[PDB]
Every structure is written in C-alpha cells, then in structure tokens.
Amino acid sequence: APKELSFGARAELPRIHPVASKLLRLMQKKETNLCLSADVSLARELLQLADALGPSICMLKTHVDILNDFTLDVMKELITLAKCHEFLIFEDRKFADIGNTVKKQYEGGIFKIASWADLVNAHVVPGSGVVKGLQEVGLPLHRGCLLIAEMSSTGSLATGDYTRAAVRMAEEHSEFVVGFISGSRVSMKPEFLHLTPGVQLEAGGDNLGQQYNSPQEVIGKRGSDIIIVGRGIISAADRLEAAEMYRKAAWEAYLSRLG
Amino acid sequence: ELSFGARAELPRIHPVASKLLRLMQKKETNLCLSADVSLARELLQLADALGPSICMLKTHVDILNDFTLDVMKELITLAKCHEFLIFEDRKFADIGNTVKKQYEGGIFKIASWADLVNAHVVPGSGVVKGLQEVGLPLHRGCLLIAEMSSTGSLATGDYTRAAVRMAEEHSEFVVGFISGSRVSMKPEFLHLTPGVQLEAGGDNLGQQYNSPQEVIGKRGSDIIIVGRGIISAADRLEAAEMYRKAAWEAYLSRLG
Numbered sequence A: 001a002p003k004e005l006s007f008g009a010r011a012e013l014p015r016i017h018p019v020a021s022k023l024l025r026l027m028q029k030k031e032t033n034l035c036l037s038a039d040v041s042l043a044r045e046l047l048q049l050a051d052a053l054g055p056s057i058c059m060l061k062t063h064v065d066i067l068n069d070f071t072l073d074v075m076k077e078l079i080t081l082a083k084c085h086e087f088l089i090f091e092d093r094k095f096a097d098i099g100n101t102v103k104k105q106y107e108g109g110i111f112k113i114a115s116w117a118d119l120v121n122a123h124v125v126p127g128s129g130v131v132k133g134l135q136e137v138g139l140p141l142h143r144g145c146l147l148i149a150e151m152s153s154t155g156s157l158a159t160g161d162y163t164r165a166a167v168r169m170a171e172e173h174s175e176f177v178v179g180f181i182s183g184s185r186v187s188m189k190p191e192f193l194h195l196t197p198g199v200q201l202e203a204g205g206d207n208l209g210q211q212y213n214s215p216q217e218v219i220g221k222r223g224s225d226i227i228i229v230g231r232g233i234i235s236a237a238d239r240l241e242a243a244e245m246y247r248k249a250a251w252e253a254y255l256s257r258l259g
Numbered sequence B: 001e002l003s004f005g006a007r008a009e010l011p012r013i014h015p016v017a018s019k020l021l022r023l024m025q026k027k028e029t030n031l032c033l034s035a036d037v038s039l040a041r042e043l044l045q046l047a048d049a050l051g052p053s054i055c056m057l058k059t060h061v062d063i064l065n066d067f068t069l070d071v072m073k074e075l076i077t078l079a080k081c082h083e084f085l086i087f088e089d090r091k092f093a094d095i096g097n098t099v100k101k102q103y104e105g106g107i108f109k110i111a112s113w114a115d116l117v118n119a120h121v122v123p124g125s126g127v128v129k130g131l132q133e134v135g136l137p138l139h140r141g142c143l144l145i146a147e148m149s150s151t152g153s154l155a156t157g158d159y160t161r162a163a164v165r166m167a168e169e170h171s172e173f174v175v176g177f178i179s180g181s182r183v184s185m186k187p188e189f190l191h192l193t194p195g196v197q198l199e200a201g202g203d204n205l206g207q208q209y210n211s212p213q214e215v216i217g218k219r220g221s222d223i224i225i226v227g228r229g230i231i232s233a234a235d236r237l238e239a240a241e242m243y244r245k246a247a248w249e250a251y252l253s254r255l256g
C-alpha cells in the first residue's frame, strides 16, 4: 500500500474522473461517505428520504425498476434534491448484457437512465463489450460507471480471477469507469472509488443470501471508501438518526485509516 | 437423444418446459425471435407475422419507448393465437431480495406477462431463491446464464459448472440455460443459444456469431435465439423461416 490520501486530495489526482472528483469533494465538504440505498416502491417515500437524508449522504442509490409510480418528473424532483443537498444519483442497474443491448438499456426505454444518473454499475461477466457499449452513451453525457468486482451475497462467484478481471477492465476503461462495487479494496490506484453494499451495524443477513458487515470492518479493516446501506436505515423508525449513525461510523473509520 | 415431443413427457419436466416442447414439436420450430425493437407497434407486428414460425418471443421491455401493460396484453393475445412463449431477457443479477421486487413489481410487472425470465448466477443461489418466491406461485420458469456469446465472457469453466449445479438444485423453477452449447446431460433441461447468425461475424461491441447448424447440430443446444439476423433483414418473415428451417433440420439430423 502507498500512503493514503484524503478524499479532498484524491479529488485532485491527475487521472481522476470528473464525476469521481465531484463526489470526492462533496464527501470531504459534508463529512459523509454514506450512500443511501433508497429501496422503496413509492416515489413519495423516495423523495421524502432524499430530502430529509440528503444532508447526511454523499450519494443516493436507486432501483428505478421497483418504483411502482416512476415517471421522469420524479427524477426531476430527485435531481433538484441532489443539487440542493449536494449528492450524486447512482442507478443500481447492475447491467449484464452484451454491449449492443446495454447501450439501449442505459439510454432509452421508459427510464432513460443516462439522462438523470451520475453513475451506474455493470457486471463484468459479459467481457469488456459491456463497458464499451455503456461508454458510447455515458461519455457524451459526462457520466461514470462502477464495475462489480465482488458481491455481498452468499455463494457469490465474483471472486479470485473474476475479481482480477474486473480490476483489469476498470483500468482499461478509466475514461468511463470510476471504481468498483466490492467488499474490500480491490485496486491500489487511488483514482478508483470503492463502494460497499452489505453493510449494517449489527451482525447478520437476510433470508435470501444477503450478508452484512459493519462500517468499521468495511471501511476500516477492508479499505473501502463508501458504504451503501438500504434496510439498515430504511427499516429503522427514525431514518434520519439511522443515517447519522451510519455516516458517523463510516466517516470515523475513514479518518482512523487516514489517520 | 429424445425428440422434443418425448422430452415434453419426461417425469421431472417443468410444466412451462413441456408446454414449450409440445408447441416446438407441433409447429416444427426451435427458433426464438429476439424482438429487439424500440416501438410497441413494430414489436406487435413482428409477433403477429412471425408468430407461426417461432416457439418463443424474447423481449427487452426496458428498451421499449412506449411500453405499457396494455402492449403486453396485446402480446399475450398473439402468444396464445400463434402458440409461442414470451421470454423477458431481463438477465437478473442482484441479491435475492432485490430481484424479487424487480421481477414482480415496478412499472413492468414482468412476472404478470413473462412465461420465462433468465438470471445470472454470479450473485449465488439467492438470486434464484428470490426469483422463485414470485415465479413458483405464478407457474413461471427461469433460465440460468451458464455461458455468454460475447468476447471476453467470464462465464466459463467453474462458473458454468456452478450454473449447472444451481439449476439442478432449483429444478422446480429453473427449466434450462442460456448457453452456447449443451452444458447439462439431463434432457429435462432446455438449452437456448443467443449469438446466432447464418453468416460468420460479430458486431462492433463484442457479440460473436455461430450458425444454427454449429449451435444445434454440433454443440447440442435446443433453441436458437436470433435478433439482428432477422430484425435487420428487409423481409423479416422470410428471414425467420430461413432460421427456423436451419435450426429445425439441425435438430432432426442430431436426432436421426
């Protein structure tokens, strides 16, 4: 490992992607490395959470394909909230098709994901055509992408050579790929962000293969940058205080690693 | 090697698989049309004209600019009229808890109109577990993606073997594979193969093509999935018939 740089300093690296630098600078300014996984089915609840929790988060992660009442105008309201509170919007679409198809899934259809999503993510299983296809729409739109190097779930096949393949692909598409979904630091290059889902304060899982680790384990011991938290926050009675708990945990773990 | 008709009757066969296998036998088609178009009107006109020639119509509804559930109602009507299955090529690849909602809910309500969906095995078996919580009650089936057609695909070796084990352990819901060749020896499982064209080639974004004769005849797969080879042709009906006769003959020759 080389000497660890603050988020603010990483935001200035020669090879940093513009989207990554925007993110890094608001993380430093706001003292948050928390990404909210806004896993709700109603546009109202999504906008209520984005508004109240916006001050506490660096990023709001969406699954637009589970919103019962999606319209583009809800994403307009979301963008306003993103601009007011200063967070990025990440559509967790986990693209996993051939380049020719992913291009259309990203740009078109009802969702027009590229129109409103600062970031998206993609699996590397199809080989590099998946990134090439996404790039063709993402680069003109000044967007970035995360590659899924590891998954949080039991029996995940994103291990060993697969994970190494994700890193190699990220390096080769640095004008579009800004980092990873992973459970650990997976690249030594500080220009890359590491975002980690499967995070809760308490040990446990769900009944469908999800596994949880703590913010201190993920950021502190495993070297990731940002925790992604859904149910840990969304299921809590006071979602604001839960968000603050996770923010303070992830931030302190980052400071101590720095540190 | 058993005929499609005989496989439809296998003791372990899923009811979706046997409905498919029966209509494949009856219609003499093992062609799945990959209806990769962005307009509902074009999708519907393709399904109607090409319906008699296909055993399955594969959609990407997330590419349809004018998706509505009424469009899917109109597609179901044609599916019943011409006798084909509807396959949403949604290539689910998230944790079990998420795919459940992506499959049942949101705008698309995929489970309400899709006979079949597919899923990547990368997340581990929870992806199947979550999908089957919605699909079993609705009497749907699922295909697991054991191999991909694209350049640099990581769905090889131990990955493919994992997909096969996962299928066999979820045989109540999983009916087969998306693969480039036969990956399983169990005749209850369907093999469907994308990356198929009559001519050698690929595209500019990593797609690779093999012929129906190579895929069905030499590699032991059951059904070809064909998109651009048909959709980009002037006369889509004659293109479909060319693909049908190729895939059908190749099957008969392997059966012989």
Ligand SMILES: *c1c(F)c(=O)[nH]c(=O)n1[C@@H]1O[C@H](COP(=O)(O)O)[C@@H](O)[C@H]1O
Binding pocket: A037, A039, A063, A092, A094, A148, A150, A151, A152, A153, A181, A197, A198, A199, A210, A228, A229, A230, A231, A232, B094, B095, B098
């Ligand atoms: C995506 C992914 F690629 C993983 O490896 N793990 C993972 O959980 N996801 C998605 O992240 C969120 C986790 O939410 P939680 O378990 O905190 O509620 C979910 O959106 C899931 O889709």
Ligand SMILES: *c1c(F)c(=O)[nH]c(=O)n1[C@@H]1O[C@H](COP(=O)(O)O)[C@@H](O)[C@H]1O
Binding pocket: A097, A098, A101, B034, B036, B089, B091, B145, B147, B148, B149, B150, B178, B194, B195, B196, B207, B225, B226, B227, B228, B229
């Ligand atoms: C999906 C998949 F998992 C593969 O391994 N290969 C593959 O091509 N797909 C999808 O199949 C269709 C092939 O279309 P064509 O190249 O004939 O137009 C596409 O819908 C692609 O998404």
